[PDB]
Enzyme design. Structure first.
Site, PDB file in Angstrom:
ATOM      1  N   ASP A   1       2.103   1.676 -14.585  1.00 36.85           N
ATOM      2  CA  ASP A   1       1.566   3.127 -13.674  1.00 36.85           C
ATOM      3  C   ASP A   1       3.152   3.868 -13.450  1.00 36.85           C
ATOM      4  O   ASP A   1       2.741   4.551 -12.758  1.00 36.85           O
ATOM      5  CB  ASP A   1       0.189   2.923 -12.957  1.00 36.85           C
TER       6      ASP A   1
ATOM      7  N   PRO B   1      15.909 -15.892  -5.868  1.00 32.52           N
ATOM      8  CA  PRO B   1      14.678 -16.172  -7.457  1.00 32.52           C
ATOM      9  C   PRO B   1      13.781 -15.459  -6.766  1.00 32.52           C
ATOM     10  O   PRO B   1      12.679 -16.467  -7.091  1.00 32.52           O
ATOM     11  CB  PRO B   1      15.032 -16.754  -8.835  1.00 32.52           C
TER      12      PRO B   1
ATOM     13  N   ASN C   1      19.538  -0.763  -2.592  1.00 28.51           N
ATOM     14  CA  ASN C   1      18.865   1.275  -2.613  1.00 28.51           C
ATOM     15  C   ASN C   1      20.346   1.232  -3.332  1.00 28.51           C
ATOM     16  O   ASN C   1      20.706   2.460  -3.120  1.00 28.51           O
ATOM     17  CB  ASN C   1      19.557   2.109  -0.966  1.00 28.51           C
TER      18      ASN C   1
ATOM     19  N   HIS D   1      15.227   1.429  13.165  1.00 27.42           N
ATOM     20  CA  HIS D   1      15.376   1.004  11.716  1.00 27.42           C
ATOM     21  C   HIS D   1      14.068  -0.279  11.330  1.00 27.42           C
ATOM     22  O   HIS D   1      13.360  -0.779  11.086  1.00 27.42           O
ATOM     23  CB  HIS D   1      17.022  -0.289  10.862  1.00 27.42           C
TER      24      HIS D   1
ATOM     25  N   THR E   1      -6.311   1.935  -7.302  1.00 29.21           N
ATOM     26  CA  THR E   1      -6.147   2.669  -8.649  1.00 29.21           C
ATOM     27  C   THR E   1      -5.529   3.671  -8.531  1.00 29.21           C
ATOM     28  O   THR E   1      -4.878   3.486 -10.588  1.00 29.21           O
ATOM     29  CB  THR E   1      -7.319   1.593  -9.549  1.00 29.21           C
TER      30      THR E   1
ATOM     31  N   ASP F   1      10.316  -8.784  -8.242  1.00 21.99           N
ATOM     32  CA  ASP F   1       8.910  -9.325  -8.704  1.00 21.99           C
ATOM     33  C   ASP F   1       7.993  -8.201  -8.219  1.00 21.99           C
ATOM     34  O   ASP F   1       6.585  -8.669  -9.166  1.00 21.99           O
ATOM     35  CB  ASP F   1       8.278 -10.081  -7.294  1.00 21.99           C
TER      36      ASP F   1
ATOM     37  N   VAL G   1      12.407 -16.126  -3.711  1.00 16.03           N
ATOM     38  CA  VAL G   1      12.113 -15.226  -2.690  1.00 16.03           C
ATOM     39  C   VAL G   1      10.972 -13.781  -3.635  1.00 16.03           C
ATOM     40  O   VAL G   1      10.714 -13.857  -4.345  1.00 16.03           O
ATOM     41  CB  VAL G   1      12.612 -14.944  -1.898  1.00 16.03           C
TER      42      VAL G   1
ATOM     43  N   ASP H   1      15.473  -8.633  11.619  1.00 18.24           N
ATOM     44  CA  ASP H   1      15.782  -6.795  11.324  1.00 18.24           C
ATOM     45  C   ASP H   1      17.135  -6.511  12.346  1.00 18.24           C
ATOM     46  O   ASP H   1      17.455  -7.365  13.157  1.00 18.24           O
ATOM     47  CB  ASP H   1      14.798  -6.022  11.035  1.00 18.24           C
TER      48      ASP H   1
ATOM     49  N   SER I   1      13.746  -0.547   2.014  1.00 18.29           N
ATOM     50  CA  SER I   1      13.584  -1.156   3.547  1.00 18.29           C
ATOM     51  C   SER I   1      12.604  -1.029   3.934  1.00 18.29           C
ATOM     52  O   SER I   1      11.534  -2.134   4.719  1.00 18.29           O
ATOM     53  CB  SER I   1      14.471  -0.588   4.259  1.00 18.29           C
TER      54      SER I   1
HETATM   55  N1  LIG Z   1      -4.585   0.193 -12.595  1.00 19.53           N
HETATM   56  C1  LIG Z   1      -4.862   1.430 -14.065  1.00 19.53           C
HETATM   57  O1  LIG Z   1      -5.526   1.801 -13.985  1.00 19.53           O
HETATM   58  C2  LIG Z   1      -3.815   0.962 -15.137  1.00 19.53           C
HETATM   59  C3  LIG Z   1      -3.417   1.379 -15.816  1.00 19.53           C
HETATM   60  C4  LIG Z   1      -2.846   1.602 -16.958  1.00 19.53           C
HETATM   61  C5  LIG Z   1      -2.128  -0.258 -17.589  1.00 19.53           C
HETATM   62  N2  LIG Z   1      -3.384  -1.047 -16.303  1.00 19.53           N
HETATM   63  C6  LIG Z   1      -3.451  -0.245 -14.985  1.00 19.53           C
END
Ligand SMILES: NC(=O)c1cccnc1
Length: 279
Positions: free
Chosen positions: A260, A175, A161, A69, A16, A200, A177, A39, A224
């Site tokens: 984040d 859309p 890239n 690669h 996290t 995604d 995948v 690939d 990649s």
């Molecule tokens: N994984 C996290 O700490 C976090 C921080 C802010 C918003 N969502 C998740």
């Protein structure tokens, strides 16, 4: 399970927070799943693959990866040291030549190949395909990726890239995948990563250490490199029974670390792949 001093990207997908170096994962490690790496090939003899990699198709005079690669991407999926899913089966489909180039017709054929070939393989926990390739928009390329997904394969594709909107690239713009952008070890969008509403998920893509040809290793960067993190994560989660090929992209987005990443353009998801493993 804990792998100390792991590549930063593996540590990132089980954390996290940025800034840690141990990768934590359930010891099942993707056993019983299969990942196709479409690939330049895979150097299956690399000690890092432990006999779990094999070439199954080439469109060129050889099945050997003469580039590196494809071997690098396969290593991020499933090598013992550098891989997310350390017990998955890896299948190589060489649609790109040793310069890393391939015609769209060949790439399409390779996708259709995987959609059928999975029926020759024992993958009781499910099937993933990792596509660290692309070029300009093609409805035929997108259709082939959509067919592969529809057939029961979790398709992960690189966003590209170009530091541009991925809507103009294929198969990134399909859309149905799982389109993967790249981040760095400080939780910044990678400088080259494409973006846009079609993305995604993000995965580690800057300075990624993995396998290379000649039994070697090296660190390189790209969407990649982010894509096989997500492909390996899908295989790992499917082995755990938490999701399926048809639902794994949504599940990864549902369970991602949210909000984040920095330098995410308005309108692009701020979601970073995360395995939610609790020992
Ligand atoms: N994984 C996290 O700490 C976090 C921080 C802010 C918003 N969502 C998740």
């Amino acid at each position: 399970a804990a792998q100390t001093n792991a590549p930063w990207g593996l540590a990132r997908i089980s954390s996290t927070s940025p800034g840690t170096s141990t990768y934590y994962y359930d010891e099942s490690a993707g056993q019983g799943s299969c990942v196709y790496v479409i690939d330049t090939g895979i150097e299956a003899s690399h000690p890092e693959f432990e006999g779990r990699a094999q070439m199954v198709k080439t469109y060129y005079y050889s099945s050997r990866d003469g580039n590196g690669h494809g071997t690098h991407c396969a290593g991020t999926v499933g090598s013992r040291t550098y891989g997310v899913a350390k017990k998955t089966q890896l299948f190589g489909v060489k649609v790109l030549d040793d310069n890393g180039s391939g015609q769209y017709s060949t790439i399409i054929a390779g996708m259709d190949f995987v959609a059928s070939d999975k029926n020759n393989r024992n993958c009781p926990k499910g099937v993933v395909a990792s596509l660290s390739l692309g070029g300009g928009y093609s409805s035929s390329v997108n259709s082939a990726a959509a067919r592969l997904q529809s057939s029961g394969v979790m398709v992960a594709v690189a966003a590209g890239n170009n530091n541009a909107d991925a809507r103009n690239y294929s198969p990134a713009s399909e859309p149905s995948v799982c389109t993967v952008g790249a981040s760095d070890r400080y939780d910044r969008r990678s400088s080259f990563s494409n973006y846009g509403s079609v993305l995604d998920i993000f995965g580690p893509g800057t300075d990624i250490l993995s396998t290379w040809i000649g039994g070697s290793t090296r660190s390189i960067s790209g969407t990649s490199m982010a894509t096989p993190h997500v492909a390996g994560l899908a295989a790992y989660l499917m082995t755990l029974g938490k999701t399926t090929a048809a639902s794994a992209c949504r599940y990864i987005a549902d369970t991602a670390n949210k909000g984040d990443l920095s330098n995410i353009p308005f309108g692009t998801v701020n979601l970073l792949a995360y395995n939610n493993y609790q020992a």
